[PDB]
Amino acid sequence: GSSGSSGEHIVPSNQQQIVRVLRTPGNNLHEVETAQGQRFLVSMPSKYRKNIWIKRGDFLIVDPIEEGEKVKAEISFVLCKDHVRSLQKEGFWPEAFSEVAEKHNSGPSSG
DSSP states (O other), rough: OOOOOOOOOOOSSSOOOOEEEEESSSEEEEEETTTTTTEEEEEEEOOOOSOOOOOSEEEEEEEEOOOOOEEEEOEEEEOOOHHHHHHHHHOOHHHHHHHHTTOOOOOSOOO
């Protein structure tokens, strides 16, 4: 069993995981990296059959699949500047990335 788990907003499931985009060859796939320094590729949901706005560095939630194609996991949702922060407060956001938002900033870089 388990204890009352938190799930007020879109939160990474047990199998799901948060990664960061790196580059896209164009096809219906995207290369991301985990918090444990692990680069891999992901597939696009059969439901998101459209031209979604995806960029490099963008953090998304992918889920691993059983013994199937040469794909590790598939995108679940697109985290926004806000979401990311939320997960950080709730205590879910990864550490390997945690040291990213701190530096990142909107507008002219003071430093």
